[PDB]
Curated annotation (Swiss-Prot), chain A:
Belongs to the TRAFAC class translation factor GTPase superfamily. Classic translation factor GTPase family. EIF2G subfamily. One of its GO terms (biological process) is translational initiation. It is linked to MEHMO syndrome: An X-linked recessive syndrome characterized by intellectual disability, epileptic seizures, hypogonadism and hypogenitalism, microcephaly, and obesity. Keywords: Acetylation, Cytoplasm, Disease variant, Epilepsy, GTP-binding, Hydrolase, Initiation factor, Intellectual disability, Nucleotide-binding, Obesity, Phosphoprotein, Protein biosynthesis. PANTHER family: EUKARYOTIC TRANSLATION INITIATION FACTOR 2 SUBUNIT 3 FAMILY MEMBER, EUKARYOTIC TRANSLATION INITIATION FACTOR 2 SUBUNIT 3-RELATED. Residues 29-36 are annotated as: G1. Residues 20-190 form the tr-type G domain. Residues 84-87 are annotated as: G3. This is Eukaryotic translation initiation factor 2 subunit 3. The gene is EIF2S3. InterPro entries: EFTu-like_2 (IPR004161), eIF2G (IPR050543), eIF2g_C (IPR015256), eIF2g_dom_2 (IPR044127), eIF2g_GTP-bd (IPR044128), P-loop_NTPase (IPR027417), T_Tr_GTP-bd_dom (IPR000795), Transl_B-barrel_sf (IPR009000). GO terms for cellular component: cytoplasm; cytosol; eukaryotic translation initiation factor 2 complex; extracellular exosome. CDD domains: eIF2_gamma, eIF2_gamma_II, eIF2_gamma_III.
Swiss-Prot record, chain B:
The gene is EIF2B5. GO terms for molecular function: guanyl-nucleotide exchange factor activity; translation initiation factor activity; translation initiation factor binding. It comes from Homo sapiens (Human). Keywords: Acetylation, Cytoplasm, Disease variant, Initiation factor, Isopeptide bond, Leukodystrophy, Methylation, Phosphoprotein, Protein biosynthesis, Ubl conjugation. Belongs to the eIF-2B gamma/epsilon subunits family. The modification Phosphoserine is found at S91, S411, S427. Component of the translation initiation factor 2B (eIF2B) complex which is a heterodecamer of two sets of five different subunits: alpha, beta, gamma, delta and epsilon. Subunits alpha, beta and delta comprise a regulatory subcomplex and subunits epsilon and gamma comprise a catalytic subcomplex. Within the complex, the hexameric regulatory complex resides at the center, with the two heterodimeric catalytic subcomplexes bound on opposite sides. Coiled coil: none annotated. This is Translation initiation factor eIF2B subunit epsilon.
From Swiss-Prot, chain C:
The chain holds residues 1 to 295 of 452 of the full protein. It is linked to Leukoencephalopathy with vanishing white matter 3: An autosomal recessive brain disease characterized by neurological features including progressive cerebellar ataxia, spasticity, and cognitive deficits. Brain imaging shows abnormal white matter that vanishes over time and is replaced by cerebrospinal fluid. Disease severity ranges from fatal infantile forms to adult forms without neurological deterioration. The disease is progressive with, in most individuals, additional episodes of rapid deterioration following febrile infections or minor head trauma. One of its GO terms (molecular function) is guanyl-nucleotide exchange factor activity. This is Translation initiation factor eIF2B subunit gamma. Keywords: Acetylation, Cytoplasm, Disease variant, Initiation factor, Leukodystrophy, Phosphoprotein, Protein biosynthesis. The keyword Zinc-finger does not apply. The modification Phosphoserine is found at S206.
Length: 410, 427, 241
């Protein structure tokens, strides 16, 4: 069983005190709905199932999956989490907007062919950045296996400009990859001394229908801790808060303050918060105010996080020429990034907070994007800019915040 | 079980009525001496809606003033209208996102534009929608209202003509696309293979712009930022099939009238239909809005006469003519298929054909007017002939002895109108 | 006389009783004292001699060349054609009352009448009444999108589409259709090119094409599974006959 406590000063990255979810390990590849099988083989069947609702954004939501690594009746050495979502562009844009995203990169490519999807995955991995490829072409001829190894060696030589030092090749491969990762995954330095900061990527309401008159607990939000550690009972505050435009003008933003009643992992978690996981903070918030995924896109802070609420931000336009790595044989203007057209709806994904916005104006140096909803991320952090090519939003450019409009109601 | 709710959009976000919209909101344009908002509100009241919200962005003050002095704002009215105004709205997507954020709707609401003339009863469609939602466990998300028609009818304007491919058995929409500027149409083959029981392509439908919606529609709008209009949402859902399936269903009616005015072509077609009692019980003499001025009497050939008309000697009202109260008609006038607003003044020997005169319009004797539109307080001098499709807006007075060309839209504002003047047509 | 029964064969007297006997009997179920059959020559231009051992009311047989399609066979047999024709195929096992199909050729004075059945790849589209087909195409010539003209929707704003339907290869055809076939050698098979050509040509004193939908039987297709199904159903079919 767990051996957690409520007395800690400076925990270690691989400290056995928590031993629940230490480093978020992302897996980006051309699996095409095959990486789920790899994650299940490496982690389990249904280890993480605590709150299920109607999915809101299936294709734009990152998915976390913890896994405990033990060796020797065995001793748990580390516990990393597999993070992978459909759509490499969204993950790449989230990674290239700050830090604390997929510390260890893995490639679940196939050893069957070298299709354009592997090239796109390699380009995404290069843009985001430690990487480690893996041959998923199980049950293949030995001569075909050697030919695939030669082809993968050629591809790795081509990619060695950015990252070319991966090595890997039905359950034996899982153990071999686990041992290689444990030997090779460097420990990431995380600053736990800063004030707690989390991004809410999921909302929930555990009040069952026809519940008790007093036994009605609500306000169990879910997300990822940005920087710092928080304990149960802390007076946390929501940076976005409740926004109401009923004032016939600028929308008043009232922050929500609540005590952190509990913190839950996939298993029973302790009061302390381990950075790098999809922790669920169950607070004493109104269940109505946070419906199913209604409270997503917010920042949970304990001491009034420095990110001030913003309505419009002036960014610096810097876009890519073509689609990164994606250039099909046809390529009939498919990899043609259009210019900064006015009144175009595009999302800015600052770290994990993804808001939307329409470009009001721009003259060659600063686009004044009015956010679709009020956001509070930073004052000069790197903000991405993604646009929908064909029913799929894809990263189009980067920029930095220079000025804009802010407000702070209380 | 919960009371019916209907979100009303009082802002046609496109620009299809300049320069008319620059002076008066489109929603308040008098169709038959009655505002379009009154028509839509009466439709909603008759069909059984109990709570309505009207969202206004353009000239919200005038719409609010008109609404607060209407019948539906009285405490005895069964519909509780609520005016929501905000200058940041730019499309229907913004309105639906605000609806989701403020969380007005409870379940199974109505989505209609603010310029819809209809008398549809949606009880059967509502029952079908609710039954399918309960049977399929929240799979169905939208229900559309379409009126059967022929591709040659004037109401089917070439701009908004649409074609659909649907499932005959389950009334499920599988493809949807407008037909503007097209000689041939394309249909994806995939929908054939998914269900090989027989798809049906329909081109005889008319888009009544009436929708039955679920809070899932609001959630999809507040997730998909790029969506701006209903067509965008429909196409995006029909291109994103496997993920969040969310089948869209359709209800087709063939015994009741429903249309949405969007341009002068549709305005004229709808006015002609309304005068000819096509939207019964809604009728100019029915006085569905209990106002003293719109009291009317109905006679042969659909000659609608208000109080204190004082028809002049020798004048002839041929058919399909409505006269506002307080109008004055000269001698030997010939008025046909036209609508004259209250308080107008017409001279002698004037010929009016398929024209539309709002309140306060003054016309000198001897004029010939065909198929044109004259906004309120306009004036025309003697020996002036107006060609079809002409437009006079907001007190513009046309000088004597001139004949305007076919396409002649004029207004006080210089740039938008093709010509601006106050005492002539030559500069 | 204005119908001249014509039987195509490019078959094999397989089954309990000869295969070619099954459609031919149908011809003697309703008149048709005389019938023209065209045999193959790639294998041997002598199958007519083998078929001459049957006991039908009256038979006419004509040999062909080694390579010749159905349209090519009609091109060869044209000098024996004087009126409208009724093209059939040897592989066809059905109990259809033929009088329905010819009625479409009779009442509406159509230029083409065909029989089409609910099978149990090629798209067809008929009008609301389900008699006059308006469109037809195959996935071979379509890449991803099915194209419909504006004019046909102007004249017919409601088209019902069928996908899994199976042809019976039975067609009542006019004489000037055969004359047009004479005028152009670009046509090699009826089903492959001739019918869609007429369907498209209906919209440029016009062309009328009608299909009758059935719900009872198909033809013995080339695959052996179809032959097995036909053998299984032959006992039930011949119970009435």
């Amino acid at each position: 069983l767990t051996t957690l406590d409520v007395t800690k000063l400076t925990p270690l990255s691989h400290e056995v005190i928590s031993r629940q979810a230490t480093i978020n390990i992302g897996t980006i590849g051309h699996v095409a709905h095959g990486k789920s099988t790899v994650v299940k083989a490496i982690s389990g069947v249904h280890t993480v199932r605590f709150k299920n609702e109607l999915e809101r954004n299936i294709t734009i939501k990152l998915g976390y999956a913890n896994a405990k690594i033990y060796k020797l009746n065995f001793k748990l050495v580390r516990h990393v989490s597999f993070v992978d979502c459909p759509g490499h562009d969204i993950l790449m844009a989230t990674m290239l907007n700050g830090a604390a995203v997929m510390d260890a990169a893995l490639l679940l490519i196939a050893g069957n062919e070298s299709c354009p999807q592997p090239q796109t995955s390699e380009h995404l991995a290069a843009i985001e950045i430690h990487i480690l490829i893996l041959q998923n072409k199980i049950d293949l001829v030995k001569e075909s296996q050697a030919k695939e190894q030669y082809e993968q060696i050629l591809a790795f030589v081509q990619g060695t400009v950015a990252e070319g030092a991966p090595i890997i090749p039905l359950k034996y491969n899982i153990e071999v990859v686990c041992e290689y990762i444990v030997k090779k995954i460097p420990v990431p330095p995380r600053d736990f001394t800063s004030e707690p900061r989390l991004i809410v990527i999921r909302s929930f309401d555990v009040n069952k229908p026809g519940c008790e008159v007093d036994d009605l607990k609500g306000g169990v939000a879910g997300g990822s801790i940005l920087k710092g550690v928080l304990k149960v009972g802390q007076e946390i505050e929501v940076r976005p808060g409740i926004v109401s435009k009923d004032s016939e003008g600028k929308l008043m933003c009232k922050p929500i303050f609540s005590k952190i009643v509990s913190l839950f992992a996939e298993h029973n978690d302790l009061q302390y918060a381990a950075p790098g996981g999809l922790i669920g903070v169950g607070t004493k918030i109104d269940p109505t105010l946070c419906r199913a995924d209604r409270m997503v896109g917010q920042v949970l802070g304990a001491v009034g996080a420095l990110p001030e609420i913003f309505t419009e931000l002036e960014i610096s336009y810097f876009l890519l020429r073509r689609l990164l790595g994606v250039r099909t044989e046809g390529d009939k203007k498919a990899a043609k990034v259009q210019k900064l057209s006015k009144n175009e709806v595009l999302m800015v994904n600052i770290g994990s907070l993804s808001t939307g916005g329409r470009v009001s104006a721009v003259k060659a140096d600063l686009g004044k994007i009015v956010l679709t909803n009020p956001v509070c991320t930073e004052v000069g952090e790197k903000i991405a800019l993604s646009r929908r090519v064909e029913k799929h939003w894809r990263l189009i450019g980067w920029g930095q915040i220079r000025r804009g409009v802010t407000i702070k109601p209380t | 079980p919960p009371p019916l709710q209907a979100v009303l959009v009082a802002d046609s976000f496109d620009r299809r009525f300049f320069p008319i919209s620059k002076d008066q909101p489109r929603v308040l344009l008098p169709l038959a001496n009655v505002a379009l908002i009154d028509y839509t509100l009466e439709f909603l009241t008759a069909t059984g809606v109990q709570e309505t919200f009207v969202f206004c962005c353009w000239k919200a003050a005038q719409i609010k003033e008109h609404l607060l002095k209407s019948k539906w704002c009285r405490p005895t009215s069964l519909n509780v209208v609520r005016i929501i105004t905000s200058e940041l709205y730019r499309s229907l997507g913004d309105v639906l996102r605000d609806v989701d954020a403020k969380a007005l709707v409870r379940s199974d609401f109505l989505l209609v534009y603010g310029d819809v003339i209809s008398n549809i009863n949606i009880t059967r469609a509502l029952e079908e929608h609710r039954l399918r939602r309960k049977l399929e466990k929240n799979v169905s998300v939208m229900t559309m209202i379409f009126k059967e028609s022929s591709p040659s009818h004037p109401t089917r304007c070439h701009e908004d003509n649409v074609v659909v491919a649907v499932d005959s058995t389950t009334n499920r929409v599988l493809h949807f696309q407008k037909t503007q500027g097209l000689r041939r149409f394309a249909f994806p083959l995939s929908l054939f293979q998914g269900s090989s029981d027989g798809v049906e392509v329909r081109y005889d439908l008319l888009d009544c712009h009436i929708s039955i919606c679920s809070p899932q529609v609001a959630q999809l709008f507040t997730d998909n930022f790029d969506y701006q209009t209903r067509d965008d949402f429909v196409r995006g859902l029909l291109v994103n099939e496997e993920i969040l399936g969310n089948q869209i269903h359709m209800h087709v009616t063939a015994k009741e009238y429903g249309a949405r005015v969007s341009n002068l072509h549709m305005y004229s077609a709808v006015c002609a239909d309304v005068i000819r009692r096509w939207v019964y019980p809604l009728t100019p003499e029915a006085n569905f809005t209990d106002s003293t001025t719109q009291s009317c009497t109905h006679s042969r050939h659909n000659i609608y006469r208000g109080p204190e008309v004082s028809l002049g000697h020798g004048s002839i009202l041929e058919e399909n003519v409505l006269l506002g109260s307080g109008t004055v008609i000269g001698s030997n006038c010939f008025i046909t298929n036209s609508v004259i607003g209250p308080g107008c003044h017409i001279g002698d020997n004037v010929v009016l054909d398929q024209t539309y005169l709002w309140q306060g319009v003054r016309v000198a004797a001897g004029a010939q007017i065909h198929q044109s539109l004259l906004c309120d307080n306009a004036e025309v001098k003697e020996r002036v002939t107006l060609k079809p499709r002409s437009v006079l807006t907001s007190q513009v007075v046309v000088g004597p002895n001139i004949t305007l060309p076919e396409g002649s839209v004029i207004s006080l504002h210089p740039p938008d109108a093709e010509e601006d003047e106050d005492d002539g047509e030559f500069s | 006389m204005e119908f001249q029964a014509v039987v195509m064969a490019v078959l094999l007297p397989v089954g309990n009783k000869p295969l070619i006997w099954y459609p031919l009997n149908l011809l003697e179920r309703v008149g048709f004292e005389e019938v023209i059959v065209v045999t193959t020559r790639d294998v041997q231009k002598a199958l007519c001699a083998e078929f001459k051992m049957k006991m039908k009311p009256d038979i006419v047989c004509i040999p062909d060349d080694a390579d010749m399609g159905t349209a090519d066979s009609l091109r060869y047999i044209y000098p024996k054609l004087k009126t409208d024709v009724l093209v059939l195929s040897c592989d066809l096992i059905t109990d259809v009352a033929l009088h329905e199909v010819v009625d479409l050729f009779r009442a509406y004075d159509a230029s083409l009448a065909m029989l089409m059945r609910k099978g149990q790849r090629d798209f067809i589209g008929v009008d609301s009444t389900g008699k006059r087909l308006l469109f037809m195409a195959n996935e071979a010539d379509l890449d991803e999108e099915l194209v419909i003209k504006g004019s046909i929707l102007q004249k017919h704003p409601r088209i019902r589409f069928h996908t899994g339907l199976v042809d019976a290869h039975l067609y009542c055809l006019k004489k000037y259709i055969v004359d047009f076939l004479m005028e152009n050698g670009s046509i090699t098979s009826i089903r492959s090119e001739l019918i869609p050509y007429l369907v498209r040509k209906q919209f440029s004193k016009s062309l009328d094409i009608y299909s009758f939908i059935k719900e009872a039987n198909t033809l013995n297709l080339a695959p052996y599974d179809a032959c097995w199904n036909a053998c299984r159903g032959d006992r039930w079919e011949d119970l009435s006959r």
